[PDB]
RNA sequence: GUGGUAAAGGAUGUGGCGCCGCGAAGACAGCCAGGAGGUUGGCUUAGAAGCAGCCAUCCUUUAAAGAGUGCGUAAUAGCU
């Protein structure tokens, strides 16, 4: 375990120098009264000042755990060496605190997620893999200790799955699956090829939380404006001196509907409203899906030029391309061994990527 | 609820049985004037009362709406109103005890029981509990 | 024969601290010669142990301060018993710990070298009373006696 | 200019009856002095010092001063 220890120390270490200097600029800032007489200003001041709580304790606590262990650890099979080992068992649940502080920082990491597998380049073979990944991610959820609700499944032509979708019930289901989007490369002799040669195939994967609605809130009076007016066409003297035309304009969007079918202003206002609803509902509905089209913008590559992590069963080895990391047990990987992988590699990269972007050019 | 259907209006003659005395609670609210009090009106006062003393004592509701409220959809004369538009109401005649509060201080009962009076279509009055019993 | 300027109350660890806020703000926006200032602090906490000492600071006309160290607050003494670092969320329904009206006494004697209260008998209700409105009750036996 | 024709609801309009408490051992008002100590009540909160929100009922100097009325500061002190 000496390996993952120095690793967690390395994570906390680069935090040190950066937040080291970042703290010193901020602290002498919080000294002046002129700084505080700017209320909203010294708010975000005390915010960064706050971040120095999670910064300090990690470095301090972890720094001392490295050294102390190193000493009474090197050599002994019985006495004081096994005395020092379970002192780091509590330090192992303190490694726990560290990891939780690196993952939980997603928009909706904490809530359950929704995974979807959709095959790609590779034909009948490509979809055979889609199902392999289905069981893969499914099987992982069982071990993570999570309930899997399969929302939709659709077997393909020969091999079985043109598409599939799942609901990983639990907590941090999203934060955990989050770094599993993108395509996946799969090399092997094709169980469908009459010659059996090596064939690359590609499946797609995506992931998402869950949310609410907004409909009726809009029909609130003060937002729209209703005009009356004489109708048009037939009515005789009735249509003349009887205004039964109605037009509800939805001021917030300008969108409007007008109606003058019946002879009743009340029955016409009733109708217009009932149609403005449906129109206004579709607009707001699109806007919802239009936000998910900007979540397609978060990542939405093609289908086989691009990859994320290769799985070759020939030479036995998976390879997350995002991290350079490797392995040689695609069998185990295609079963659930993801914690270690996702944890470090995926979280690290994902978080450090967007994080360093945000604090350097975003 | 169950009963049956729609019910005639009937008048609100003198507040004879229209009334009572404070049953439970430290204080209460009495009707000075006859009226039909709607379901909505009731709940309005209730939720008001609670909202005032959050996590508070106990509010009793001595009145209860069981008269069906008929009404016509903007038409003329065939049949009796499909009614029930405001839904239901309670016959409150001068004297009746409508709400009992308990487990709070005067300044709380007074205030809350007053705020409630603002939701009711009627002139009202808040009583201590004298002693007059039976 | 002593020029003062402004009283400023701070709570801190005895013999352990740094500028760090809200201490930074106070003596930071009002100046600090913490060289010789924190030199009288280390001796005033040389043989002295740790706690939540409320040192009643009072800036001087030379922009200094009156660093009169005082006995750590009642909440401090109480959690010296239950081994905590806090107090009950809601003094009433919940009760984190239950102590002795005996222990209160010898820890209350620690409090009288600064407190104004005359006798330790009146200093029994004060410390018990602080423990009252902080989420912890007690037990006693002698009390009044009388006829 | 009520009378000479409106409702919830409001207010130190004015008159009359009634109950309660204070005061010549000095009341109400105004006005001079303190108005305090552990305390900075406990809990949350970036912060939460009688004084955001949550929980609540100590004693001491005294003739007197609330774990607190309202303002106010980022939080104080402040004035009350
Ligand atoms: Mg250590
Ligand atoms: Mg050593
Ligand atoms: Mg052993
Ligand atoms: Mg051990
Ligand atoms: Mg980690
Ligand atoms: Mg379902
Ligand atoms: Mg087909
Ligand atoms: Mg099939
Ligand atoms: Mg074949
Ligand atoms: Mg073939
Ligand atoms: Mg063959
Ligand atoms: Mg509205
Ligand atoms: Mg025409
Ligand atoms: Mg015609
Ligand atoms: Mg015609
Ligand atoms: Mg007409
Ligand atoms: Mg007309
Ligand atoms: Mg027409
Ligand atoms: Mg028509
Ligand atoms: Mg929009
Ligand atoms: Mg392609
Ligand atoms: Mg296995
Ligand atoms: Mg009605
Ligand atoms: Mg007609
Ligand atoms: Mg009672
Ligand atoms: Mg009472
Ligand atoms: Mg009202
Ligand atoms: Mg009313
Ligand atoms: Mg009234
Ligand atoms: Mg009776
Ligand atoms: Mg010295
Ligand atoms: Mg000065
Ligand atoms: Mg007139
Ligand atoms: Mg009136
Ligand atoms: Mg009035
Ligand atoms: Mg008056
Ligand atoms: Mg006197
Ligand atoms: Mg004071
Ligand atoms: Mg304090
Ligand atoms: Mg605090
Ligand atoms: Mg104060
Ligand atoms: Mg404040
Ligand atoms: Mg008692
Ligand atoms: Mg000032
Ligand atoms: Mg502050
Ligand atoms: Mg003050």
UniProtKB/TrEMBL annotation, chain A:
Q: Which Pfam families match?
A: PCRF, RF-1
Question: In what way is this protein post-translationally modified?
Answer: Methylated by PrmC. Methylation increases the termination efficiency of RF2.
Localization recorded for this chain is: Cytoplasm
| Annotated SMART domains | PCRF
* Keyword Cytoplasm found: yes
Q: Which residues carry this modification: N5-methylglutamine?
A: 237
Q: Sorted alphabetically, which keywords does the UniProt record give?
A: Coiled coil, Cytoplasm, Methylation, Protein biosynthesis
- The residues forming a coiled coil are 266-298
- Looking at the record, the residues that make up the Prokaryotic-type class I peptide chain release factors domain are 230-246
Write down the PANTHER family for this protein, in alphabetical order: CLASS I PEPTIDE CHAIN RELEASE FACTOR, PEPTIDE CHAIN RELEASE FACTOR 2
Name the family the entry cites.
Answer: Belongs to the prokaryotic/mitochondrial release factor family.
- Name-wise, this protein is Peptide chain release factor 2
Can you name the source organism? Thermus thermophilus (strain ATCC BAA-163 / DSM 7039 / HB27)
Quote the gene name from the UniProt entry: prfB
